[PDB]
Amino acid sequence: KEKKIRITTNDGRQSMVTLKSSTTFFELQESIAREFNIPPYLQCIRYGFPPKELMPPQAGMEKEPVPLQHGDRITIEIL
Amino acid sequence: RPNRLIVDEAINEDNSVVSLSQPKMDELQLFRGDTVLLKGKKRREAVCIVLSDDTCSDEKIRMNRVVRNNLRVRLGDVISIQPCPDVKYGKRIHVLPIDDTVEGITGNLFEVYLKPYFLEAYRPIRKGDIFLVRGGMRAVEFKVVETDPSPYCIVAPDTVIHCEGEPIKREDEEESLNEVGYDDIGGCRKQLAQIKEMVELPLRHPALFKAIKPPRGILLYGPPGTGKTLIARAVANETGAFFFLINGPEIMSKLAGESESNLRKAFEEAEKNAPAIIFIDELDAIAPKREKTHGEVERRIVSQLLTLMDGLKQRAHVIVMAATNRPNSIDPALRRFGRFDREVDIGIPDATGRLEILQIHTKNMKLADDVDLEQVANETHGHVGADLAALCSEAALQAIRKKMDLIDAEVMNSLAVTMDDFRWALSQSNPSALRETVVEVPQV
Known part of the structure; x- marks a missing residue:
């Protein structure tokens, strides 16, 4: 009942984050805003290899936990 | 040291992914998608990306052929892996x-x-x-x-x-990936694993067998075109053992005395490049059943081959493997203990094996979305690996001839093989082993 996610930004500020199994896109957005000054609307999320894009869920299916798994890294983009 | 890991083949076909077991990943504190700086043998450094793999031993680290060559490392070697967060977006x-x-x-x-x-x-x-x-x-x-x-x-x-053109020549240190590797063989995964367990240790660590017997003769038999020569070349290349092909027709072509001298010098040269693998292709051509042979020189050459195989005993680190169609095809006294004591049956690829072979032979080809190798692999009943390769080549030729009516690399990449081309090739497949006994794990 937890997740351990590395956050790496193109800026170079590497960081660690603790998540929970039930997590929505807004939770990660606000966590990133807390850890880094990047606004939640100026971050484009790439994860995996090839890095799939993780955009905010559209209307209808934004309640379920984000498919992010425990033990992977997330790349952060700055607009 | 935890960073020390034993190299292994990679299921993930991506060129820049290193697969690791999740226990080892967390032990190394490596997060999926992070860069890793693998250290090779001759101070070779390879920057790759680490991905977890459930089917991977903790010590085992799975790598692609390209990464292995970049590190000048072969399967079973030991490499050092650590995170390398200091990676910049080079311009x-x-x-x-x-x-x-x-x-x-x-x-x-x-x-x-x-x-x-x-x-x-x-x-x-x-x-x-x-x-x-x-x-x-x-x-x-x-x-x-x-x-x-x-x-x-x-x-x-x-x-x-x-990319300013001017292609650079291949330095001898580099080993071209055009060479055969374990990933170039499909269908015979079990037989390839058997050959691995049989020959890897003697070839990789000859000193161990020098101290503490080793297999000296492996007879790969099966319908022609199953890649027996391909398997032997892959094994020799991957283990870094000198490879010497002795084609049966080549020896038989030589005149009496010339052929025996050629065989003897081939064996001697293989010995002098130890560790080495000698592949006697089409052994039935050199040493057929006793009744079949009706020539003094043929019996002399068979006896010479027997004598050389026996003389391997005083030699070491030399593994002789041969290709045939059935053990009874070659004469007895060649399977006697020592000379060609071990046997392997490549057999006919199964549905999954045929699919794997098709994927291997269609890597470079650009096939449209409607192309589904599963359906064709099901369709191709009683097809040998050579037959599947020929079928893929025929499909490519069909696409090429269709497009020609309308070489520039852009044009080549533009054309895409369609399922219609594969169906046509099937219609012109002409299988070569439609009568062989079918052995596989039923999907029912």
Whole structure:
């Protein structure tokens, strides 16, 4: 009942984050805003290899936990 | 040391992914998608990306052929892996092709191979690395001559890639990926694993057998065209053992006395390059059943082969393997203990095996979305690996002839093989082993 996610930004500020199994896109957005000054609307999320894009869920299916798994890294983009 | 890991083959076909077991990943504190700086034998450094793999031993680290060659490392070696967070988005990266793989292909090697390969995947790159890009039914090599952050770099959409032509010659140290590897053989996964367990240790660590017997004769038998020669070449290349092919027809062609001398000198040369593998292709051509032979010179050559195989005993680190169609095809007294004491049955690939062979032989080809290798693999009943390769080549030729009515690498990559072409090739398949006994694990 937890997740351990590395956050790496193109800026170079590497960081660690603790998540929970039930997590929505807004939770990660606000966590990133807390850890880094990047606004939640100026971050484009790439994860995996090839890095799939993780955009905010559209209307209808934004309640379920984000498919992010425990033990992977997330790349952060700055607009 | 935890960072020390034993290399292994990679299921993930991606060129820049290193697969690890999740226990080892967490033990190393390595997060999926992070860069890792593998250390090779001769101070070779390879920057790759780590991905968890459930089917992987903690010590085992799975790598692609390209990564192995970049590190000058073979399966079973030990490599050092640590995280390398200090990776920058290099801007100026100078990359060149390799002449041996860009002969006869024109057009800029960008927007054809390099651009789709990089695109936005953020593939890590290090100075001096060699990577393989598949396209236009050709596997083009590329050497990373320079990177803006020396030496480690990660490509970015805004990264500027320079490909000024002038293909560079292959340095002898580099081992061309055009050479056969364990990933070039499909269908016979079980038989390949058997051959591995049989021959890896004697070839990789001859000193151990020198101290503490080793297998000296392996007889690979099965319908022709199943890649027995392919298997032997793959085993020799992967284990870094000198390979010597002795084609039966080649020996029989030589006149009496010439052939026996040729065989003896081949065996001696293989011995002097120990560890080495001698492949006696089409053994039935050299040593057929006793009744079949009706010539003094033929019996003399068979006896000479027996004498050499016996003389291997006082020799060491030399493994002789041969290809046939059935053990009874070759005469007895060749399977006697010692000389050719071990046997292996390549057999006919099964549905999954045929699918794997098709995937192997269609790597370079660009096949449309409607092409589903599963359906064809089901359709191709009683097909040998050679038959599947010929079928893929026929489909490619069909596509090429269709497009010709309407060589530039852009044109080659533009054409895509369609399921209709594969169906037509099936209609012209002409299987070669439709009568052989079917052995497999039923899918029912």
